[PDB]
Amino acid sequence: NLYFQGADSCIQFTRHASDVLLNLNRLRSRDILTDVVIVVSREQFRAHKTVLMACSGLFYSIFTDQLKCNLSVINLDPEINPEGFCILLDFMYTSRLNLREGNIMAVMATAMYLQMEHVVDTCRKFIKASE
Numbered sequence: 321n322l323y324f325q326g327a328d329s330c331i332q333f334t335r336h337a338s339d340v341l342l343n344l345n346r347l348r349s350r351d352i353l354t355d356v357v358i359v360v361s362r363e364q365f366r367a368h369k370t371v372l373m374a375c376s377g378l379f380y381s382i383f384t385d386q387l388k389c390n391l392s393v394i395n396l397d398p399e400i401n402p403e404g405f406c407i408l409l410d411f412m413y414t415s416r417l418n419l420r421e422g423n424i425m426a427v428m429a430t431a432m433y434l435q436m437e438h439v440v441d442t443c444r445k446f447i448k449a450s451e
């Protein structure tokens with residue numbers, strides 16, 4: 321699965337980016353090279369800082385701060401919904417957002433807190449649709 325693109329007809333691999341995420345998610349599943357624990361409502365989630373900061377303005381802020389980037393444990397606001405966070409973390413590693421009637425408000429609040437603008441805009445659009 322490859323194709324050509326641009327002024328220099330460079331070869332692009334269609335599945336490369338998704339294959340990288342698949343492999344990063346496999347690392348996460350096996351706890352390989354995870355370098356941070358996120359604590360949400362007394363539940364712990366192991367992850368890779370680079371993936372978190374690639375997806376979230378809040379994590380980008382934290383992990384580019386000279387002081388804060390040395391923490392191996394990051395606590396979130398205790399009002400954040402841990403399912404909401406799990407849904408968003410899974411999205412970071414898969415591109416798949418498991419949005420449902422019963423979780424959309426929690427997901428949207430969590431995505432606001434995490435500064436995940438495209439997810440927030442998507443939640444808003446689904447909410448507007450059901451008004």
Ligand SMILES: Nc1ncnc(Nc2ccccc2)n1
Pocket residue numbers: 342343344345346347
């Ligand atoms: N997480 C994960 N799982 C499986 N394989 C890899 N990387 C890899 C292994 C062999 C050849 C090419 C890539 N990463």
